[model samples]
Target chain A: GIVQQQNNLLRAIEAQQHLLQLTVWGIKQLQAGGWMEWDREINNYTSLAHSLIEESQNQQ
Target chain B: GIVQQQNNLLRAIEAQQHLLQLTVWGIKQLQAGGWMEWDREINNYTSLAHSLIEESQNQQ
Candidate 1:
């Protein structure tokens, strides 16, 4: 049902906040010259976010 | 196929509209003096919209 998909979309959006926060933190870390942890975290978050987007697109 | 991707793009656009609506509504609520409630909603919607944009960009 459309409602189910909308609910799923909402959940997906909520989950995205974690990635966003991680991205911001990652950028901060990168700027501060701590490329190891923050860069990897940011890359991971970006990858997850990208995958979610791909999944949503395919659902269309 | 490009047509499929286009179709997917359209769906993503529609979903973005939902986020836009929620964001507007949240702002309205915030302005009406419901910070505790509306602020959270606004943040949620804003975060969702950002993620959607990020996703769309990566798809290109």
Candidate 2:
């Protein structure tokens, strides 16, 4: 039961990470294309994505 | 024990949903700024976000 719960949670986290990464990638594309300027929201999302990667790997 | 597991899962889902929403929001901002063109990746992200909302709400 515990393993099942962990699996589900991990799956959700992975999915969330995917979405975050996609968003970051999209923003990067915009930036690279010279269509977007960096802003607070972008910075926040990038920061959160970084933290998620760290915590996910740490299994915290 | 079951309740705790459910609670953890629900929280994770909520967090995931938030990330998805933020991602969608960022993409929308890009579109509104007339900076991003509709493409395969953007379409895929939008589609995934919608399905995530549906399944999350339905508790599936």
TM-score of each: 0.33, 0.49
Please identify model 2 stretches exceeding 4 Å from their true place.
A33-60, B1-6, B33-60
Instruction: Report the CAPRI category for model 1.
Output: incorrect
Compute the lDDT of residue B51 as modeled in candidate 2: 59
Error of model 1, residue A2, in angstroms: 4.1
What's the CA error at residue A42 for candidate 2, in Å? 9.9
lDDT tens digits, residue span A1-60, model 1: 443444444455545444355335433533434467856876797778778766866665
**Tens-digit lDDT string for candidate 1 (B1-60):** 654654475477557556555545543544433235434654665667666555544444
Q: How far is each candidate from the true structure, as Cα RMSD in Å?
A: 12.8, 6.0
Query: Which 10-residue window of candidate 1 chain A scores lowest in summed lDDT?
Result: A23-32
lDDT of prediction 2: 0.60
TM-score of model number 1: 0.33
Per residue, candidate 2 scores C-alpha lDDT tens digits across A1-60 of 554455455555555566666666666666543334555677787788678767865774
What lDDT score is found at residue B36 in candidate 2? Answer: 42
TM-score of 2: 0.49
CAPRI tier for the interface of model 2: acceptable
